[PDB]
Amino acid sequence: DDSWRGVSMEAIHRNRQPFELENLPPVTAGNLHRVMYQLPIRETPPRPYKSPGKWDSEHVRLPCAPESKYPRENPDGSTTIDFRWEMIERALLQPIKTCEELQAAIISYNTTYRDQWHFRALHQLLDEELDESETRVFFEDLLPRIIRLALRLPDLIQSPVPLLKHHKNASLSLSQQQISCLLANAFLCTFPRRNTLKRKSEYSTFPDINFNRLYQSTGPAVLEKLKCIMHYFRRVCPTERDASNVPTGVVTFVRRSGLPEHLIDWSQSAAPLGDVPLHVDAEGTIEDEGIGLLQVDFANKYLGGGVLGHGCVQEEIRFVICPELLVGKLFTECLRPFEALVMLGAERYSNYTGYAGSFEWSGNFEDSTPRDSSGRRQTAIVAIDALHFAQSHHQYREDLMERELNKAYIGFVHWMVTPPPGVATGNWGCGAFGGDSYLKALLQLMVCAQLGRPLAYYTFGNVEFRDDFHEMWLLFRNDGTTVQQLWSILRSYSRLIKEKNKASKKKLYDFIKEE
Ligand SMILES: Cc1cc(Cn2c(=O)n(Cc3cnc(C)s3)c(=O)c3cc(S(=O)(=O)NC4(C)CC4)ccc32)n(C)n1
Ligand SMILES: [Cl-]
């Protein structure tokens, strides 16, 4: 009758309006929080913060650094060592009228990759997908705006951009405007030292950021991601007339890194599972129906996954409809097992249809989501990376159930004085990545019970699973089942599977029935 089972959405918000409960404290500058704009925000967009630039192992190597030098071959075949930022400016201010000339300009400061990079998805989009006039508008309007924005980087970033490395709790806050500039540079593949595919290299524990690998990819989902990105730049680049369309606010990136001190012993959790306000919806999406909640990103340990590539499932889609997330790739070291990344403030610019191979851009989206005191849209996303399984049976090992419990734990912790809003999630690391929906739902319930967060769970058209999970929360509620007690049952199922989906839930019935 209704799409959903369990408690209502009013309930998930603790009967207060969405957005009254916040997911992150306000931005303030500190030892553990670098802020790229001036506090407090008076004018908009925020005014950039000024401090000496850094070209070192602790900060982003910015394309405009005076330390960035580059060899050029010449007309006549000799070598000049020049400043790469000067070469980038010269290349991008030559006229560029075709897809081939764009590729040659980008390659002119990436000459190592001359015979490896071919921007086939860009050729497909401009030569075959758009008609002659939409393509003329690309070269006469859009691309000049992207270049002009990229070339303002020394004006918009006047402060070193720190890397968020392994095992450090740190935050970084930037303006949406600053992010549009960094992303324009990525679009034009300007970031130094971030292209090599060599196995052990300076940045190999970091994601890719230059957009070349997207351009090298194929198929319809890749073009639709390109359309999302184009659209973002139409939305946020100043037009020839004015700059009133430029976004006004802020985005914050928080590396959460758990200490041994924070590790839950799951057999000592007396938390009642049925006391979790659980809302299980078979329609709806996290980005729409989960407004006000901590929304989950079914992440790869490299933030963004294959968004610059062939990837086009849950993570990748979020990163092209809310492209400000992409800048996380620039400074976020890959996640270790007891770490997570919270991203607050990312505006949505695109609508979409489908999923995976059927993903399509389906139009403009005007985000009216309210901004917090710090100038951030109150869209809070946590990146947590599930394990992938070649073998489904492997996931029922005790150590790898604990791993996932602890991964979701560090993603979902609150660590603020005000009460935590609900989490909005779903079949995390399931489908083709090997995970069991039935188990991953319980692990997430355990974590929410333990932390005291409501849980809004989306099954995406699967009514059967909605019911099996609702019914199993009812058995917990009136048996007063407990985290440690469900852990005990789950460890039993571990040793059972060893000696050799729908059957996990059958055997809790059994171990529960005896109580
Ligand atoms: C209501 C709805 C949405 C969708 C499409 N979709 C999807 O198919 N999957 C995979 C699965 C399909 N059927 C299953 C039983 S799983 C999704 O995982 C999915 C996820 C989202 S989301 O996470 O809310 N948002 C994004 C993409 C921004 C992060 C949305 C649609 C999904 N379906 C079938 N039914
Ligand atoms: Cl030159």
Numbering used by the authors: 26 to 525, 533 to 547
Provide text from the study.
The main enzyme responsible for degrading the bulk of PAR chains is poly(ADP-ribose)glycohydrolase (PARG), which hydrolyses the acetal bond within the ADP-ribose polymer, but cannot reverse the protein-ribose linkage. We further show that while Drosophila lacks ARH3, there is a striking evolutionary adaptation of dParg that confers functional equivalency to both human PARG and ARH3. The dParg structure is composed of a central macrodomain fold that harbours the predicted substrate binding cleft as well as the catalytic residues. The macrodomain is extended by a highly structured and conserved accessory domain so that the overall domain is composed of a twisted, mixed, ten-stranded β-sheet flanked by two predominantly α-helical sub-domains.
To confirm that dParg regulates cellular PARylation levels during DNA damage, we treated S2R+ cells with the PARG inhibitor PDD00017273 (PARGi). However, we observed that ADPr was dramatically stimulated in PARGi-treated S2R+ cells upon DNA damage in comparison to DMSO-treated S2R+ cells. These data suggest that the PARGi developed against human PARG (hPARG) efficiently inhibited dParg activity, thereby blocking degradation of ADPr in Drosophila and allowing enrichment of ADPr sites. PARGi binding overlaps with the adenosine coordination region within the substrate binding cleft. The binding is tightly coordinated with staggered π-stacking interactions between Tyr380/Phe485 and the 2,4-quinazolinedione moiety as well as polar interactions with the main chain of Ile311, Phe485 and the side chains of Glu312, Gln339, and Phe485.
